[PDB]
């Protein structure tokens with residue numbers, strides 16, 4: 001049977017598949033056609049149906065897992081299209097995590113003799129993240145940060161070493177946000193969460209601008225000016241608020257200029273997309289900073305798919321965490337951002 | 353000259369006026385007509401122009417201030433209409449605070465010989481709050497909370513004593529949010545702030561629903577169902593998330609159901625007004641709780657005008673702080689919610 005791990009989130013299903021590359025002559029003969037056509041279908045296509053995507057650039061090659069050499073593949077599709085996935089499956093031990101492992105448990109069991117083992121979101125995320133960093137990204141660092149995030153002429157992606165990764169604050173930006181404090185391989189807790197996450201950005205953006213995809217929303221935001229919608233410290237004070245070290249450019253009230261009808265009439269959809277992105281991102285950064293301070297942790301790693309192909313938000317998080325913490329905290333990012341739960345699920349396979 | 357204190361915020365100007373009631377026979381004769389017509393105009397009207405309002409129910413009567421007995425009056429109008437206020441003034445020592453004391457400094461000096469003394473927002477808020485609580489609300493408690501905020505059949509406003517008020521976490525919800533830690537009468541700090549405040553509610557509401565006033569926005573929200581826009585824990589898990597004590601009713605992603613076109617098409621403006629209010633209010637509550645935990649303070653007082661005639665948000669804050677803190681924190685409220693900076697300004701008058 002094929003080796004999958006699946007993280008069924010509120011928005012996206014993430015799938016990790018291990019493709020063995022040490023298939024012997026005897027093993028190839030003694031393999032069932034449906035197993036052969038699964039591997040063929042998955043490795044010969046990068047789009048699956050109309051909404052499935054293989055993130056080819058993330059592939060881990062020549063990985064030794066469970067005593068086999070193979071390639072680790074990373075695949076995603078909308079949770080909305082899980083019925084299509086299950087129907088295809090009805091035309092195997094499945095380790096699954098995320099809320100959808102519970103919600104859609106009965107649906108997966110419509111696949112005859114399929115064994116569904118549910119694993120907790122937290123153990124899977126932590127196990128997957130530590131594993132991927134431990135095997136490296138094909139010899140390159142899995143973890144990176146933005147050096148000199150204060151000056152834009154100097155700001156550049158640089159690798160970051162996590163050989164001793166503890167303690168770690170993990171900020172998981174999915175539909176919502178979960179915040180975890182990791183003190184060791186077996187000692188971690190969910191510190192808190194916020195409901196202002198990726199689904200808020202996408203939902204509000206679609207309401208305000210009519211955008212029809214995550215990528216279109218980011219493309220509108222790259223052309224916008226959030227200060228058209230937001231009220232800044234200088235709009236209230238006429239400059240800096242010296243007494244409390246608030247610069248004139250800080251946002252005092254997100255969307256706060258939209259209380260005036262004349263401003264609502266002149267703002268562009270691109271401006272509103274950017275103000276939505278900036279509002280959500282800054283609020284995540286601030287919550288992350290308060291949790292780091294309370295947990296006494298200075299390394300904050302951001303994961304989840306809100307940050308995929310989203311350099312605006314990454315740079316904003318890098319700059320804001322460094323500025324508002326007076327350099328006490330480092331914003332850290334990971335190449336395999338959205339897939340750690342799916343990997344951790346796959347890694348629970350020996351337990352069954 | 354009349355005794356005013358003024359807090360010019362980003363959205364509202366708040367004015368406290370002390371009306372002496374011990375005016376002797378000689379003092380009344382030796383008073384200039386313009387001084388007489390000011391007092392007459394202010395005490396004989398409750399609407400001023402088309403946007404000024406005297407909050408008559410807040411009046412403090414027979415207060416002894418600066419060695420005179422008088423009544424303390426509380427008046428508000430939009431910062432947008434401050435030019436009208438200044439023009440009326442051109443047809444006095446002014447203690448002023450808030451950002452607008454700096455921004456509009458030069459405008460106030462167009463009033464001949466008027467002396468403008470700017471006072472810091474923080475000192476004024478703390479001084480005003482402690483003063484009003486110390487003199488009481490005409491013999492009644494200035495401070496109150498919602499008893500048994502968990503059960504709605506029992507939930508009722510009850511008075512709360514602040515005779516020793518320290519330490520105190522003050523959460524000032526204006527256009528944005530400022531959070532203060534008060535350890536004594538002369539020892540207080542701004543802990544942090546958030547830009548998701550009252551102006552966010554009003555700005556987003558106006559964009560999403562077309563509402564044209566704060567009160568209309570609250571009226572739409574009272575008729576709405578935020579779960580039409582928000583994605584709940586049970587939408588993702590199918591129930592509670594037992595492992596982390598997240599109830600199925602908690603919001604997992606604010607506006608997170610609005611990523612689906614069919615849901616955007618069926619949601620009502622009232623639903624979106626309520627989701628806006630709930631999103632902003634819960635985020636303020638969560639930030640307040642994290643700051644309380646980090647400052648080791650268990651009493652959290654909420655002020656500012658986001659909460660005036662807004663019992664939905666007060667009850668939401670009362671219930672959420674008690675629930676998520678497992679009863680460790682008390683949400684506290686004050687009758688003179690939006691006016692403490694204006695009172696504190698007035699109290700700086702002897703210094704000049």
Ligand SMILES: Nc1ncnc2c1ncn2[C@@H]1O[C@H](COP(=O)(O)OP(=O)(O)NP(=O)(O)O)[C@@H](O)[C@H]1O
Pocket residue numbers: 008009010011012013098099173174175176177197198199200201202214303304305306307308338588604
């Ligand atoms: N193709 C995409 N479609 C939808 N959302 C996307 C896409 N790419 C990135 N995103 C963003 O990524 C978020 C989902 O991230 P993800 O980490 O996969 O959450 P999730 O696991 O589905 N939700 P959760 O149950 O809270 O853990 C969305 O809210 C978007 O902001």
Ligand SMILES: Nc1ncnc2c1ncn2[C@@H]1O[C@H](COP(=O)(O)OP(=O)(O)NP(=O)(O)O)[C@@H](O)[C@H]1O
Pocket residue numbers: 236252360361362363364365450451525526527528529549550551552553554566655656657658659660690
């Ligand atoms: N009549 C009203 N008009 C406008 N906003 C109102 C009104 N009544 C209540 N509000 C709410 O109260 C908020 C303003 O509160 P307030 O404490 O007066 O802020 P502010 O001092 O003007 N702003 P700031 O500079 O950040 O301190 C608005 O954002 C609304 O949510």
Ligand SMILES: O=C(Cc1ccc(C2CC2)c(F)c1)N1CCN(c2ccc(Cl)nn2)CC1
Pocket residue numbers: 099174175176177178192193194195197585588598602603604605634635636637638641672673676
């Ligand atoms: O964690 C969350 C939200 C959440 C839930 C679930 C998930 C994903 C599916 C697993 C998330 F990403 C996010 N909340 C707990 C803390 N909250 C508050 C609110 C008020 C106060 Cl006063 N304090 N805290 C807000 C709710």
Ligand SMILES: O=C(Cc1ccc(C2CC2)c(F)c1)N1CCN(c2ccc(Cl)nn2)CC1
Pocket residue numbers: 233236246250251252253282283284285286289320321324451526527528529530544545546547549
């Ligand atoms: O206080 C504020 C906002 C603010 C300013 C001014 C006023 C009123 C006029 C006086 C407010 F009500 C609110 N901010 C500091 C903390 N912020 C962050 C952001 C990212 C990170 Cl990572 N950390 N912190 C956000 C900005």
Ligand SMILES: [Mg+2]
Pocket residue numbers: 009010098174175
């Ligand atoms: Mg997820």
Ligand SMILES: [Mg+2]
Pocket residue numbers: 361362450526527
């Ligand atoms: Mg104010």
